[PDB]
């Protein structure tokens, strides 16, 4: 029943102030919570609940 296995959270990293330019060729993320699909993973299983 313990949260955060190993005591984990996103502790602040902050390094040497490297001024690289980065031209920023994006991976766009059409799964910025594709979430309608994971509510739908719960409904691919509510459809199983009604049939059952």
């Amino acid at each position: 029943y313990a949260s955060s296995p190993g005591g984990v959270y996103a502790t602040r990293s902050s390094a040497v102030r490297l001024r690289s330019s980065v031209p920023g060729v994006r991976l766009l993320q059409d799964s910025v919570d594709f979430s309608l699909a994971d509510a739908i993973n719960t409904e691919f299983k509510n459809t199983r609940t009604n049939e059952k």
Partner: protein
């Protein structure tokens, strides 16, 4: 006829370090210590008493 170069082409260092920011990824990458309470979420007790 000795060449008379001072600093002579301005004076400002070298081209030469625009201080590209060294982010603190010299820290340790975070401890992902999450936990799953996978047992108590099915309260397995004999009410047959």
């Amino acid at each position: 006829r000795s060449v008379s170069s001072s600093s002579y082409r301005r004076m400002f260092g070298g081209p030469g370090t625009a201080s590209r920011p060294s982010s603190s990824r010299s820290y340790v990458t975070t401890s992902t210590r999450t936990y799953s309470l996978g047992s108590a979420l099915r309260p397995s007790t004999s009410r047959s008493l």
